[PDB]
Amino acid sequence: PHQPIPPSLGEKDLSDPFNFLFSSNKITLRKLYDLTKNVDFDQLRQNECKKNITLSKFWEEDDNWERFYSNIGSCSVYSDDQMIDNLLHDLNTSPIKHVHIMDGGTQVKFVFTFKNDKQAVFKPMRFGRDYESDPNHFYFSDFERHHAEIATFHLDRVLGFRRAIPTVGRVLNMTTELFEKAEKKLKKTFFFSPAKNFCFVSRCDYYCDTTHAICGLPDMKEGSVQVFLPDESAVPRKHNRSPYRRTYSKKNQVAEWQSSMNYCTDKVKTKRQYAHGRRLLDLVDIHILDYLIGNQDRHHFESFNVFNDLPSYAIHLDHGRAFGRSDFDDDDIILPLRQCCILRPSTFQTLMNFYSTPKSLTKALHESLSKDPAHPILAYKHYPAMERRLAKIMSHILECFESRGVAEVLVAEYNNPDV
Template sequence: MKSLFKPKLRIRFITFIGYSLVCAVILILLVFQLNLNLNHKSFLGHVDTKHEIQDWWHTIVKNSGSPDINVSIKAHDSFNDLQVLTIEPLDASQYDKYADVIVSSSSISKAAQNRNNFNELRLIIIKNGSSLNRFHRHITRFDMYSEENAKIVSELLKDMATQPILHVEQKTGGTQLKLVITYQNKMKALFKPMRFPREQQTLPNHFYFSDFERHTAEIAAFHLDRLLGFRRAVPVTGRLLNITSEIFQKTDAELMKTSFISPANNLCFHGKCSYYCDTSHAICGQPDTLEGSFAAFLPEESERKIWRHPWRRSYSRKKKAQWESDNKYCEKVRRDPPYDEGRRLLDLIDMSIFDFLMGNMDRHHYETFRMFNDSFTIHLDHGRGFGKAFIDEMSILAPLLHCCQIRSSTLKTLLDIHNGNEPLSKSLKNAMSNDPIAPILWEPHLNALDRRVEIILNGIRNCIRNVQHAKDEIEETSEV
């Protein structure tokens, strides 16, 4: 035993133990990954990405200083097979093969359409009014705003974050507390308060319909929608409020009746709503400072139509929706208006991609503007997004995966993001960096975006292969 502690032998012994531990860790991780892969074969299930260790496995081995262990690093997939399908127009052979999957953007070209906005359709806009009024004037049937009107959007975000608050009232309806904020010139915003820290995720035993809303999800959704080129979400900003001077002194007695001082000496209130408005679900300041999201109101003069989402979940603890077990569900959806023609089905597929990136499962209805023929689908209410950073809920992509169809422009945007110099996570983080309550998202939620972009592209690739395989089988049968 004494010889064991001679310097040379001691170094060899420590090195041997170190390499043994590294090998043991790698073996455990391999078994762990294999086990998870066996448990996640359902494409419309969910993928638990905590087992995705390849990226940081290389770092562990590299830092161990071992030159003898070779670890393969996953090569970047540029999806060249998909990139060629975004070049318009497709040649004849490609068109015959892929036109059902990749829908040409030229078929719904904005330039070929009458781009009327609200003002041209005689919606009453207050002359020299607020930034919200100017924003309303530039809404078209194609999008909420254009990048040419970016200055107006910036002004609106600044005003919602800084203008004095004149009045506060509780929004009626809904399962959780929301406040209607009124500024000067009758400008209004919808306030969603902070409930918990950014790193707090959806509780494992909570259903999607019992999850709390996050004010940060609303802010991040607006910026994500803009980065994806959809521009169908209303502008949203964060803001810090003083509960006493900016809420209680501006509201009625009903909201004040629900206020109290918590055991931690923080000022709290809970308001009145369907489910989560009681002392155990109260909104509390620190001690009376509260942050939240402020979403711009849409024009009160414009009528909006509410539609039941065809891929709506059951909102039941036991039952499943029809689409969750019917592989031909999309064929049934396509038979009926408004999904049998126009942009609506493609809009819902865009929305499913948008929701999947956020992890938002709470999409039971959607809205459109009545005054526009074939209006774009409005992206509203994203408070239950960004709740699970390590789980990718594949069922959110059901419209895309069931219908196997996507706009060429959407596919091109995803490919540009995936192959660009800056990942989506960094672009979104930079876009939100100037928000008054930045940082907005927990870092794992940002990292999940890059992983999910690749998942979407793989799903599209599989769709194309499946469609082509089905066509080949039909051709072989007809030849026989």
């Protein structure tokens, strides 16, 4: 079957997820050690965030949604892992009151309204964990992977960013939790395949059709469950076009930043929004995240616009098109690091230590993913891929230093002398 059962309901893979060969380059490691061993990282980390305050203290707790919303910080989506794990557990277990077709993106997704009237975003499982994207597919043709959303949230935490949105795996009874709880116009898009599996078409721009319907085996269906963002009226948001947006066309397949190595110097460092602040440092952080997971679909950034007079940060969202290929690294994604050559000091240290201990990043990710009820979240073949991609990032960091000085790269805030 193209759409298999949730792996958690299948035979348990007992194989060693780390019986693969990886040995980090020691030359690169030591060279990255000398130019930074005397840098006062402690002083730097304290400048990466101007003012660290939450929404509750700014606006001057019945459930885990409300405590999450209140604890949304000005330099982070969340701190305190234990309450998020409580929110995750709640997202997995809370009874569903309503299911509605979600208004927004292009691929199939529902908004869950729980009994307590709180909400979440649902993205249905389609293919298995082992599935790799068609090599002929562009970034805009890939069907989203629910398990990538889960995997990235955990990885975003492991990297200490905590700017992704809490997401948990969940296996639904399509009859009781989806169909019977679905709005009428969604309800009518349900049907049975010739194999007597339960299926729904839903309605959306991207292949919500009979041919590409989501189907259970026969009646269960795993999906990613992501806590809804706080209301737009209460916590408004900004939608910003990325300067490293891809072309999204098959004819002209090469954007300027893909062909021009001076793109960062000439086209973004000189822009109003990026010349001063944290935005560019955010962009480097997110493309490091996108490169590790192979996410090519970063066309826009989403940010809260609620902490007045404080710099906003990009919310690490939309990771459905990540983890599509385990045997391919898209060096184009990490281009902003190579072109801009600035890097948040905490990120460097965080990136460090992980590299200095081979397999530690992927090990630190796996146990984190394991606590998700839908584990295994990622096929193990993606683990060596992430270690390799990490190594390239380190090499690319080394390149940034000698060309554009080491004291010019590691900054807690970015300022362009010419704006």
